[PDB]
Amino acid sequence: AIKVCMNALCGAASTSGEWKKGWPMRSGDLASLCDKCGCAYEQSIFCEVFHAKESGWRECNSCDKRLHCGCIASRFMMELLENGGVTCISCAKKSG
Amino acid sequence: IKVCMNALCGAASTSGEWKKGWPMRSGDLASLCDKCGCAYEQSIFCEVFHAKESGWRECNSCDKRLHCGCIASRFMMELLENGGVTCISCAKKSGLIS
Numbered sequence: 001a002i003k004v005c006m007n008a009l010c011g012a013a014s015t016s017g018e019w020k021k022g023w024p025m026r027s028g029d030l031a032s033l034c035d036k037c038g039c040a041y042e043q044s045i046f047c048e049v050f051h052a053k054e055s056g057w058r059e060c061n062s063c064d065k066r067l068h069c070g071c072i073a074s075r076f077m078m079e080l081l082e083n084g085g086v087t088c089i090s091c092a093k094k095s096g
Numbered sequence: 097i098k099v100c101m102n103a104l105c106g107a108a109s110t111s112g113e114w115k116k117g118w119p120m121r122s123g124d125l126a127s128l129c130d131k132c133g134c135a136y137e138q139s140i141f142c143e144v145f146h147a148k149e150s151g152w153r154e155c156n157s158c159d160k161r162l163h164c165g166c167i168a169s170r171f172m173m174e175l176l177e178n179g180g181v182t183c184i185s186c187a188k189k190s191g192l193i194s
């Protein structure tokens with residue numbers, strides 16, 4: 001396959017250094033991210049930097065953290081609550 | 097006491113049938129009264145009960161609205177590799193049914 005940045009709103013076909021590790025894709029393999037997108041992802045702010053204008057934002061039920069929902073990039077950064085809404089992964093570790 | 101598992105309903109009775117709802121965190125299907133369950137079966141549960149919540153998006157290839165970050169709508173869509181979501185019809189048409 002052609003290797004390209006898996007941020008679909010970037011799609012860069014080249015990068016500085018090696019490709020960076022991204023989020024798990026549906027197949028389980030890790031996404032390839034360019035130097036920019038991968039840098040945001042490493043700092044845990046990919047969606048805040050690159051999905052700021054997309055729909056689907058909610059907030060964590062236990063803290064102020066905004067969470068981009070319906071998004072593969074943030075998919076394992078939150079938990080779906082039985083009574084509605086989401087909590088981020090830190091608060092989820094704190095609540096069992 | 098058996099109660100409708102839509103927290104904004106909680107009716108203690110039902111007409112005809114308790115209907116099967118969304119898969120809960122444990123994997124079991126929720127028990128819904130006939131109202132809420134009919135809304136669920138027609139894929140409009142979140143449109144009826146969650147219209148004012150955050151988390152709403154649009155299907156990647158059609159106009160269907162999809163309530164994301166919501167356990168009730170979680171088997172009503174598929175997450176795409178491009179960061180968006182697709183409804184179940186578009187998913188069946190694209191080969192993405194998991």
Ligand SMILES: [Zn+2]
Binds near residue numbers: 033034037
């Ligand atoms: Zn990129």
Ligand SMILES: [Zn+2]
Binds near residue numbers: 046051072073074179
């Ligand atoms: Zn995102």
Ligand SMILES: [Zn+2]
Binds near residue numbers: 087088089091
């Ligand atoms: Zn939180």
Ligand SMILES: [Zn+2]
Binds near residue numbers: 101102105107128131
């Ligand atoms: Zn009900």
Ligand SMILES: [Zn+2]
Binds near residue numbers: 146163167168169
């Ligand atoms: Zn909903």
Ligand SMILES: [Zn+2]
Binds near residue numbers: 157183
């Ligand atoms: Zn669709």
